[PDB]
Amino acid sequence: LLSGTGIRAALSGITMGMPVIGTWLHWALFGGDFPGEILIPRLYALHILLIPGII
Amino acid sequence: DFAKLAAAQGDAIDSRYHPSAAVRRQLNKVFPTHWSFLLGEIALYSFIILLLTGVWLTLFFDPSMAHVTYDGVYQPLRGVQMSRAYETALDISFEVRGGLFVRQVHH
Amino acid sequence: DFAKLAAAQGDAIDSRYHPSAAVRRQLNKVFPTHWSFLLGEIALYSFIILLLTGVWLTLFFDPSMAHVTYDGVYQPLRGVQMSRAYETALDISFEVRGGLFVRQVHHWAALMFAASIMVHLARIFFTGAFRRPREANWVIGSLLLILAMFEGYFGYSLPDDLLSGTGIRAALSGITMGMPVIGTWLHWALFGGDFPGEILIPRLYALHILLIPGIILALIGAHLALVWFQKHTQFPGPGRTETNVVGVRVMPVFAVKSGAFFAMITGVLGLMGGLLTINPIWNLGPYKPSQVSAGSQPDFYMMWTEGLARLWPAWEFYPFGHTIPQGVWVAVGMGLVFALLIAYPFIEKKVTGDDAHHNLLQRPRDVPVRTAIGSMAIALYLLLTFACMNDIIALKFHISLNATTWIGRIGMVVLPAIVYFVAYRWAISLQRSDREVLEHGVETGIIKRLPHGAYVELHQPLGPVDHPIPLEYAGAPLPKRMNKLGSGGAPGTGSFLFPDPAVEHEALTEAAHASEHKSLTALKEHQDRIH
Amino acid sequence: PTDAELAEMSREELVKLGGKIDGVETIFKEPRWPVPGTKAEKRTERLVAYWLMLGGLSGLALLLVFLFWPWEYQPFGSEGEFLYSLATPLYGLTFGLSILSIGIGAVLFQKKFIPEEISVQDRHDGRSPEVHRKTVAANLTDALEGSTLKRRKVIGLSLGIGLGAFGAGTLVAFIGGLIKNPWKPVVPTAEGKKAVLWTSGWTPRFKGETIYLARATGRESPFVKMRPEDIDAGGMETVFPWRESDGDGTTVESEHKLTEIAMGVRNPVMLIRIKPADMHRVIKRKGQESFNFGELFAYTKVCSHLGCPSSLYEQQTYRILCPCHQSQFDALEFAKPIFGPAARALAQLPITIDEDGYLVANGDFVEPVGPAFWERK
Amino acid sequence: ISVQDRHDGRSPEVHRKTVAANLTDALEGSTLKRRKVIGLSLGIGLGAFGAGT
Amino acid sequence: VAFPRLNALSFWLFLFGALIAIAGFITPGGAADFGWTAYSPLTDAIHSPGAGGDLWIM
Amino acid sequence: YAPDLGDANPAQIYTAMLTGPQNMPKFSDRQLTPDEKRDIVAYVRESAETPSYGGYGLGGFGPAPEGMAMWIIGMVAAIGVAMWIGSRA
Amino acid sequence: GVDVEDVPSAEWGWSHMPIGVMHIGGLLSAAFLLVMMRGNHVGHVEDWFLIGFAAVIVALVGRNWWLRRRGWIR
Amino acid sequence: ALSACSPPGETASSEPGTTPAIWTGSPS
Numbered sequence A: 001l002l003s004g005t006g007i008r009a010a011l012s013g014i015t016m017g018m019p020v021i022g023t024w025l026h027w028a029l030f031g032g033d034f035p036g037e038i039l040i041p042r043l044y045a046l047h048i049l050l051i052p053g054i055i
Numbered sequence B: 001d002f003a004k005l006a007a008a009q010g011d012a013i014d015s016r017y018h019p020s021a022a023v024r025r026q027l028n029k030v031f032p033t034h035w036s037f038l039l040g041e042i043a044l045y046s047f048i049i050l051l052l053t054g055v056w057l058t059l060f061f062d063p064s065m066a067h068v069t070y071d072g073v074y075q076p077l078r079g080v081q082m083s084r085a086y087e088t089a090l091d092i093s094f095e096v097r098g099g100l101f102v103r104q105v106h107h
Numbered sequence C: 001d002f003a004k005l006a007a008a009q010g011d012a013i014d015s016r017y018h019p020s021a022a023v024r025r026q027l028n029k030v031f032p033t034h035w036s037f038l039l040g041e042i043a044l045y046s047f048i049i050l051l052l053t054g055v056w057l058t059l060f061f062d063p064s065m066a067h068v069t070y071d072g073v074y075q076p077l078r079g080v081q082m083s084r085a086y087e088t089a090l091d092i093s094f095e096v097r098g099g100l101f102v103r104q105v106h107h108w109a110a111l112m113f114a115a116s117i118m119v120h121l122a123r124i125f126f127t128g129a130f131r132r133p134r135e136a137n138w139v140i141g142s143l144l145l146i147l148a149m150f151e152g153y154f155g156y157s158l159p160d161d162l163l164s165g166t167g168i169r170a171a172l173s174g175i176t177m178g179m180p181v182i183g184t185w186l187h188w189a190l191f192g193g194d195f196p197g198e199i200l201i202p203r204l205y206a207l208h209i210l211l212i213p214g215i216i217l218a219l220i221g222a223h224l225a226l227v228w229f230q231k232h233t234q235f236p237g238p239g240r241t242e243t244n245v246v247g248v249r250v251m252p253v254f255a256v257k258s259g260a261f262f263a264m265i266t267g268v269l270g271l272m273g274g275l276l277t278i279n280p281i282w283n284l285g286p287y288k289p290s291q292v293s294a295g296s297q298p299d300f301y302m303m304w305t306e307g308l309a310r311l312w313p314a315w316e317f318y319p320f321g322h323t324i325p326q327g328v329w330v331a332v333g334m335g336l337v338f339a340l341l342i343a344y345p346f347i348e349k350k351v352t353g354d355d356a357h358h359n360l361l362q363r364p365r366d367v368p369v370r371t372a373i374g375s376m377a378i379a380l381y382l383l384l385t386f387a388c389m390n391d392i393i394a395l396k397f398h399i400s401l402n403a404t405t406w407i408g409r410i411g412m413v414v415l416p417a418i419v420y421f422v423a424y425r426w427a428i429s430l431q432r433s434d435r436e437v438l439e440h441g442v443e444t445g446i447i448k449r450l451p452h453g454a455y456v457e458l459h460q461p462l463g464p465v466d467h468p469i470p471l472e473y474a475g476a477p478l479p480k481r482m483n484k485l486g487s488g489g490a491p492g493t494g495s496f497l498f499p500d501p502a503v504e505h506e507a508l509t510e511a512a513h514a515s516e517h518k519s520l521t522a523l524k525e526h527q528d529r530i531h
Numbered sequence D: 001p002t003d004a005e006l007a008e009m010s011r012e013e014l015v016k017l018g019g020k021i022d023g024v025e026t027i028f029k030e031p032r033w034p035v036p037g038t039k040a041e042k043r044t045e046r047l048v049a050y051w052l053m054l055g056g057l058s059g060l061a062l063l064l065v066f067l068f069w070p071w072e073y074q075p076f077g078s079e080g081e082f083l084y085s086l087a088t089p090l091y092g093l094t095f096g097l098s099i100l101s102i103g104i105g106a107v108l109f110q111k112k113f114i115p116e117e118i119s120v121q122d123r124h125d126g127r128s129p130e131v132h133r134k135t136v137a138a139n140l141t142d143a144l145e146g147s148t149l150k151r152r153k154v155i156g157l158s159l160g161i162g163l164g165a166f167g168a169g170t171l172v173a174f175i176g177g178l179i180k181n182p183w184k185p186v187v188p189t190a191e192g193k194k195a196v197l198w199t200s201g202w203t204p205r206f207k208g209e210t211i212y213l214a215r216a217t218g219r220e221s222p223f224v225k226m227r228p229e230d231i232d233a234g235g236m237e238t239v240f241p242w243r244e245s246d247g248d249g250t251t252v253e254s255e256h257k258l259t260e261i262a263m264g265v266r267n268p269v270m271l272i273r274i275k276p277a278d279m280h281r282v283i284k285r286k287g288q289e290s291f292n293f294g295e296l297f298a299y300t301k302v303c304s305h306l307g308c309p310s311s312l313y314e315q316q317t318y319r320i321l322c323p324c325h326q327s328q329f330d331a332l333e334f335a336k337p338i339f340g341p342a343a344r345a346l347a348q349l350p351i352t353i354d355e356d357g358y359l360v361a362n363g364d365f366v367e368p369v370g371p372a373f374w375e376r377k
Numbered sequence E: 001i002s003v004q005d006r007h008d009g010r011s012p013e014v015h016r017k018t019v020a021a022n023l024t025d026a027l028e029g030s031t032l033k034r035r036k037v038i039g040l041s042l043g044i045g046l047g048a049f050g051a052g053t
Numbered sequence F: 001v002a003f004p005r006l007n008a009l010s011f012w013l014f015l016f017g018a019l020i021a022i023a024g025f026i027t028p029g030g031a032a033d034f035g036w037t038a039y040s041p042l043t044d045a046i047h048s049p050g051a052g053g054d055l056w057i058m
Numbered sequence G: 001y002a003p004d005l006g007d008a009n010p011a012q013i014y015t016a017m018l019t020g021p022q023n024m025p026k027f028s029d030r031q032l033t034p035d036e037k038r039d040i041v042a043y044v045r046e047s048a049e050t051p052s053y054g055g056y057g058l059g060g061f062g063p064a065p066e067g068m069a070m071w072i073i074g075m076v077a078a079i080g081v082a083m084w085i086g087s088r089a
Numbered sequence H: 001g002v003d004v005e006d007v008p009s010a011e012w013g014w015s016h017m018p019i020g021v022m023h024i025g026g027l028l029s030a031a032f033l034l035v036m037m038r039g040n041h042v043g044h045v046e047d048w049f050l051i052g053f054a055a056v057i058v059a060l061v062g063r064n065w066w067l068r069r070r071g072w073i074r
Numbered sequence I: 001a002l003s004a005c006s007p008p009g010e011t012a013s014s015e016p017g018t019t020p021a022i023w024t025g026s027p028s
């Protein structure tokens, strides 16, 4: 619940609110509206491989 | 035994790869001894820990948003609709020996 | 405008990091230009493709064994109950623009990765590049081969479909379960319980996108570091010696050649990923323990294993209250093979007592025993691979399944021996052909009838004549056609339809002839002076 | 060379000096077009240009085809399925053609315009010079000798003990989360709690449980009871252990139970009706002489070799065949393996009929079902 | 207490001159500067492939 | 001979065609079972439909 | 062997299910109901008549033709390109 | 273990295998072909194929051993 | 590469066995 609230507030609301390309960014990232189905797998692939590799 | 063995291993390594000049250059590198020059080291070392425990966590975590009913050992959440990721996180915490410890060390 | 920018950037870089000596050392490094020395690079470039496409595939794949109903766009699977991994693989193939293309490019890149590793291993083994000081580099290569095999296995096991799930159940479950003392313990450590569990796919996904790729990346880095600082081998030749490298410097010939080869390999992989279908998962359906298909084969780099399990004859043991099944043999088989691959340089070093530093490669014909052993191993591998595919061979080519089984069983004994004999004799016969050329000169194919009736062939000596003085073999290839020594001349310069004026033809032909003489002269002077 | 005379070296001389410092001598390097102003040079330049331009136009085609082609999947036998089928081949064609043409242009530029060279580098391999080897050996030996760890056996022994103990503890606490006992009794049974490998869905659970052989309809109610007359002679059926208390797939718990019985690796059973004209040929296994109900025999659908579904029933030879490794069992001889890598017979399930006549299992398998392991027999 | 020399800042002049010579020699002997069409088509093709990919 | 390479080609075409025609025994249906004269209606896809006859022809 | 089902009209499929000729199990009208038989007929015809989406279907058998294609097209082309770029001797 | 007359490029690489390895290899291959007759199969054509191939292998090994023992083959 | 062993508990029989009795199930 806590981390889901954090995802909604920051990763979703701020991304959605941006100008011209904001909702486009939100729908590219979440694959749709905020309670999507490809959010946790996407964050998992970003978090165990992508960002650690770059780091 | 472990003197002639070390000499033989050194001879073999130097005949195959001849790193003596480069290795000696690395051994003679001088480093200042101020305590603050250790701060960066901390950021490195914890990172290594984050890798090790991290790999361990990948052996039990399932990153899914599919809905399930818990049906586990932790009573206050039995029969509760959750996600597969939350279920496997609870399984790391409660079902795996040392899973909670590895989770807490990682965080 | 860009010259001043280049000069200022170089001055800033040198003032900040002073890399001039090291950069110049890396730019002047000389790499031999033999075509076979490119083989390893293929395994590199495909691997890079495997990274790139791989990252793409990680943005859409959910590796969950949870079961859901499809309700996707693919009608012939609407309402079918499947795992979440299979549904997400279907969504990649159908719901993401270019997702099918990325999947197919990824699978084709995996296949090319395995195949090019095998061909590079063949090159290394037959040329004798595993010899001192390059034994550890052979060990690293063997580890990379094993890791790539298992990485590809896990990869195509990731989408839980009927074929990959059947392969998982057969190999990774049945063989593991039957191991003598710890088999069930290994099975329940890996699967978390019985085979149709709930944790296998996430675990394989973690192993396959992060762990094995990381290990392979580190091993390839160490591999290429060894190749770079243990300078490349070379074949014996005009200007070649154990103490030098003859070729081209990195800047710019080698860099441009490597970049262009990368681009061409990417082109081949993209064309195959577009025009050829690989792993059409939606035709197989979700994995179900109650269903199986006739054509049950893994990707080719694993096929040999199944062939072994298809050919070994139902030999099981029953100690005091315990069972040792047939699958155990297969496991041991693989183990032995991998063992026999890792420690080959040390085996040959023990057998021949040859522990000398070696930088000049051997032609395979000059080492008939090792060539015979390598041909024997290749024959056995091919036979096991085809015995894995003996059901398809039986269906297409009219032959009974029992016939192919017994051909494979008898062959895994008879065929390697025949291939050893033939390869040994063939290598020695190639040696004899080299000696014949060196001692009589190249046969030009021209026959003259002498006034007394003698039919003679015109020989072109490769050295002086006393009949030529017989030259000494120097481990290098010899010409056997006269067109390869320049006798075929040059065509009229032009555009394939219209000639250039004869003055330009004369200028270009004379310049090229002068350049060829200058190059040969330079090599001759270097050879004469160093020796 | 000094700064003054470095200031007065041509680029060729500086390249020669730089190569000589690194140990490299370029013994041959000549321009590709010594003769100026020829038509052949123009032709080669235009050839390289055409290859690079084909790469550019194919990249543009990739952009256009990706953005504008109709890519969405189209159902079977409809309009627009040809364009959908061409969607992915066009991506492959454009992408591969573009990058392959760029690579070909680069190769042609190297072969035709970059000057041909023959450089020679000295390996300088083998043993290091004695100065380097002796200095590095002296540095290492001096570290070990000034450390004084050699002449302090208590510290060395304690260090070895402590590091080994910490490593052992860490390795155990690492691997230990994965180690599971396969023989922990977790499966209920009409004879208590039993290990997973000893049990399947056919194992009765309350000492008189009616387990029906249910066919998979492959649809709400994917399993249904079936009668002996629902199999014609020489016909094969895949049945599953279905009980009354499992449901019909309507409620979510019913679907969970039906899924868990359909996914049981040791659940599926092959039910075959022998033609009576061949029932004289049946040879029965010791201890299973009464497991068939007339012409209907029931065997496991799990190969005894490695657990694949041995699901190819040849009626005219009564041969059960496993496609994974081509094992052949004789259905007329208690599924004895007559060919392949299988060495153990398939388990036979005892069956009968209930009062209503529906086929039911008359007990449990009289042995473990799947592939063998250490603890079997 | 050990003391090591930095030997940092710019490189000795010989190294800088020889590196610049090697790089400009590559770029000049390649003769790509006087091939306007080849350079232009290379830029266009690389950019087209980059945009498409 | 006039064409020394065409001669070796003839020999190898012999060897491999003979092997192809004889390999019909490897088929479960067996090799050609219609005589060496291959009379017409008996050789159709209906009568003698196996693969050994096709290997014979080729 | 079990033959390729592509060139068979629906009535042949239905009667092959209904009367198992030889080493085919016999699927009676109660083991496979007529609606089930028609569903199977529909799926078989759809699978026969569907074009491959990923490109050229390599016979529809899986990894064996895929590996043969890789060894005979991809690897052959790669080795030929390497021979073009590199040198002999 | 070979001469320049037999293997021209003998100095350049491993070029001899002791004939004992080949002889015991043939005997072991024949023994494997024979022992493959124990197993699960109704038919006996494969047994005759195994016997024939084992006989050929044993005959080859016996002839080679006899000719090296008498001096003709070296 | 060694020999084969038959399973100790996989013998054949000669007794024909009795036809299975009609099944009755306990309520629970």
Ligand SMILES: CCCCCCCCCCCCCCCC(=O)O[C@H](COC(=O)CCCCCCC[C@@H](C)CCCCCCCCC)COP(=O)(O)O[C@H]1[C@H](O)[C@H](O)[C@@H](O)[C@@H](O)[C@@H]1O
Pocket: B095, B096, B097, C182, C185, C186, C189, C190, D171, D172, D175, D176, D177, D178, D179, D180, D181, D182, D184
């Ligand atoms: C280089 C490795 C060197 C160190 C190896 C690690 C040390 C091995 C022993 C592990 C230490 C004990 C930790 C807990 C182990 C324990 O005490 O298990 C008990 C029964 O052990 C025993 O008597 C002794 C175990 C005998 C070992 C058998 C050896 C087989 C090994 C070699 C094969 C496994 C290979 C693993 C490869 C990994 C594959 C994946 C990449 C009963 O299990 P169970 O009643 O099912 O309860 C479960 C909880 O135990 C458990 O934590 C779990 O978390 C709970 O879920 C629960 O199921």
Ligand SMILES: CCCCCCCCCCCCCCCC(=O)O[C@H](COC(=O)CCCCCCC[C@@H](C)CCCCCCCCC)COP(=O)(O)O[C@H]1[C@H](O)[C@H](O)[C@@H](O)[C@@H](O)[C@@H]1O
Pocket: C275, C276, D089, G004, G005, G006, G007, G047, G048, G049, G051, G052, G055, G056, G057, G059, G060, G068, G069, G072, G073
């Ligand atoms: C890289 C080149 C590839 C070019 C691809 C670029 C083309 C662009 C678009 C591609 C669209 C896809 C092409 C058509 C779309 C398509 O898939 O067309 C199949 C046709 O396939 C065939 O046979 C026709 C065979 C002719 C193709 C020949 C080329 C094959 C090459 C690639 C093989 C070389 C490797 C050789 C290996 C061995 C060499 C070493 C010894 C349907 O045949 P069908 O008549 O329905 O029967 C089938 C049966 O399995 C069955 O009868 C079944 O009943 C049917 O359902 C159907 O599957």
Ligand SMILES: CC(C)=CCC/C(C)=C/CC/C(C)=C/CC/C(C)=C/CC/C(C)=C/CC/C(C)=C/CC/C(C)=C/CC1=C(C)C(=O)c2ccccc2C1=O
Pocket: C392, C393, C396, C397, C399, C404, C407, F016, F019, F020, F023, F026, G057, G058, G059, G060, G061, G064, G065, G066, G068, G069
């Ligand atoms: C194991 C065994 C003995 C098999 C014998 C069967 C056979 C080929 C008999 C031929 C008759 C004989 C023996 C002739 C002897 C004369 C000679 C030397 C002939 C040489 C020519 C030969 C043997 C060709 C066969 C090549 C061969 C067996 C290849 C393996 C088969 C493979 C890998 C098929 C894979 C494959 C399949 C199955 C497709 O359906 C498909 C569909 C669309 C595109 C590609 C493919 C594809 O690649």
Ligand code: HEM
Pocket: A047, A048, A052, A055, B047, B050, B051, B053, B054, B055, B056, B057, B058, B061, B089, B092, B103, B104, B106, B107, C210
């Ligand atoms: C800079 C590096 C990293 C940081 C800062 C980081 C941070 C975190 C944090 C704070 C959590 C929450 C843990 C919890 O609440 O249980 C987490 C979870 C997780 N981490 Fe990392 N991590 C890093 C690297 C890695 C790596 C390299 C891996 C894998 C190799 C990994 C695997 C995981 C997994 C699977 C989880 C979810 C499991 C769980 O929450 O229990 N992490 N990460």
Ligand code: HEM
Pocket: A049, C047, C050, C051, C053, C054, C055, C057, C058, C061, C089, C092, C103, C104, C106, C107, C110, C111, C113, C148, C151, C152, C154, C155, C156, C157, C158, C159, C208, C209, C213, C216, C278, C279
């Ligand atoms: C040597 C390296 C690799 C090999 C041989 C390999 C091989 C494969 C193969 C053959 C498949 C089957 C794809 C299909 O059938 O559709 C696959 C799937 C997959 N690969 Fe890899 N792979 C490698 C590296 C990677 C890397 C580094 C990543 C991630 C960065 C990755 C991500 C994936 C994913 C997510 C899947 C499953 C998704 C899907 O099947 O569409 N792979 N792999």
Ligand code: FES
Pocket: C170, D303, D304, D305, D306, D307, D308, D309, D310, D322, D323, D324, D325, D326, D327, D340, D341, D342
């Ligand atoms: S699993 Fe059935 S033969 Fe291997």
